[PDB]
């Protein structure tokens, strides 16, 4: 503070109330455009259909072909590049199957090589992708 | 520092500690008042009075030699002006400014000084309104002002 007056409570509080908005994160929390724009709409997971398999190329120093997958959500209809992680797990993901998608730990921010891919697959057809990779369970056919 | 200027001059009178009268001075308060009456009748301010007294009669301050002050004595005898002399001198100054501008419309500096002068006037005017010497309806109005000196 600078006005250390005994009766400037109002003037102070007002000033604070104006400047909280210049903080980028508060504005992020309280204006709705971010929450609405986010397809997750303040959610951890979201279900969606696989419609095509895509090999997105990595950024520099690194060099790799990341295996992503174009899902279309049911509730909104928005389109997402959900990335499948680990080794040999893509042969499992068949086309036209429901997968539960989650975030990527960054709250609206791209991560490393995969440019603009904030989402990863957890399940396939009520079957944990982990269980398929480990070999505990099998795909129902 | 000064109000409408950057100067910060430290020059004024400095009265000494002894409030006592000197030994050589033997002119009474009554005689001084009879002089006051003549000078006020002839037409003169408390300032110019105080000046003459200190210069010729060698009596620096009446407040110190006698008990009460010069203006309150004049107020007792009904010589006080309708409004205070400083406002009198300001409006007279104001008028001369607006007069010189009347021919000389360009003098922008004169306009700036005029405006500051009027601000200073209304400041004094609110002090005197609180001191209950002017009526609530008093108002400097360049239209009516020139009637007042």
């Amino acid at each position: 503070g600078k006005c250390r007056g005994l009766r400037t409570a109002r003037k102070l509080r007002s000033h604070r109330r104006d400047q909280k908005w210049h903080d980028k994160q508060y504005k992020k929390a309280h204006l709705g455009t971010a929450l609405k724009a986010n397809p997750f709409g303040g959610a951890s997971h979201a279900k969606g259909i696989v419609l095509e398999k895509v090999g997105v190329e990595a950024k520099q120093p690194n060099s790799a072909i990341r295996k992503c997958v174009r899902v279309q959500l049911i509730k909104n209809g928005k389109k997402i590049t959900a990335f499948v992680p680990n080794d040999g797990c893509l042969n499992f993901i068949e086309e036209n199957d429901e997968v539960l998608v989650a975030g990527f730990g960054r709250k609206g921010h791209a991560v490393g090589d995969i440019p603009g891919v904030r989402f990863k697959v957890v399940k396939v057809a009520n079957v944990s992708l982990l269980a398929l990779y480990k070999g505990k369970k099998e795909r129902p056919r | 520092g000064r109000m409408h200027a950057p100067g910060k001059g430290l020059s004024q009178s400095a009265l000494p500690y002894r409030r006592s009268v000197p030994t050589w001075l033997k002119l009474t308060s009554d005689d001084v008042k009879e002089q006051i009456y003549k000078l006020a009748k002839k037409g003169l301010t408390p300032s110019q009075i105080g000046v003459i007294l200190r210069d010729s009669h060698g009596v620096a301050q009446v407040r110190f030699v006698t008990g009460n002050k010069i203006l309150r004595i004049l107020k007792s005898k009904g010589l006080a002006p309708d409004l205070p002399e400083d406002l009198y001198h300001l409006i007279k100054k104001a008028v001369a400014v607006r007069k010189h501008l009347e021919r000389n419309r360009k003098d922008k500096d004169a306009k700036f000084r005029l405006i500051l002068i009027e601000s200073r006037i209304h400041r004094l005017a609110r002090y005197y309104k609180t001191k209950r010497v002017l009526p609530p309806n008093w108002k400097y109005e360049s239209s009516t002002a020139s009637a007042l000196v």
Binding site: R4, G5, L6 | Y17, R19
Partner: protein, 129 residues
């Protein structure tokens, strides 16, 4: 304009004590200041000051010793409940053993420990240690 007489004086003395100056002249004499000095003096932190009476706001000459680390002020004058006295004296002082917070009260000008004895809250003026 000059608002706080005390606020100017106490800075002047702290800028003397940092330089180890021996005696200090302060230009406006206030009654509250005078009470303040007498409080520190009875408790032995400084010697015998003397005040120069002009039919005016007086002056004051303090013969300074060397035991005073700081003598500070709190503007604005905050009210202080007995609840807050501990948090004030905690956050405002070097330790729990020494140092003082002097607050004038209805009762009178006195230390905070004397306020604790007398059961008397009040308006914080300042502090020293």
């Amino acid at each position: 304009v000059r608002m706080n007489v005390l606020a100017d004086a106490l800075k002047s003395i702290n800028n003397a004590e940092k330089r180890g100056k021996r005696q200090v002249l302060i230009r406006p004499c206030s009654k509250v200041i005078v009470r303040f000095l007498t409080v520190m003096m009875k408790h032995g932190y400084i010697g015998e000051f003397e005040i120069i009476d002009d039919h005016r706001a007086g002056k004051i000459v303090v013969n300074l010793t060397g035991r005073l680390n700081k003598c500070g002020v709190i503007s604005p004058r905050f009210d202080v409940q007995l609840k807050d006295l501990e948090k004030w004296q905690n956050n405002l002082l070097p330790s729990r053993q020494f140092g003082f917070i002097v607050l004038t009260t209805s009762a009178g000008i006195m230390d905070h420990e004397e306020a604790r004895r007398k059961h008397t809250g009040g308006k914080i003026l300042g502090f020293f240690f």
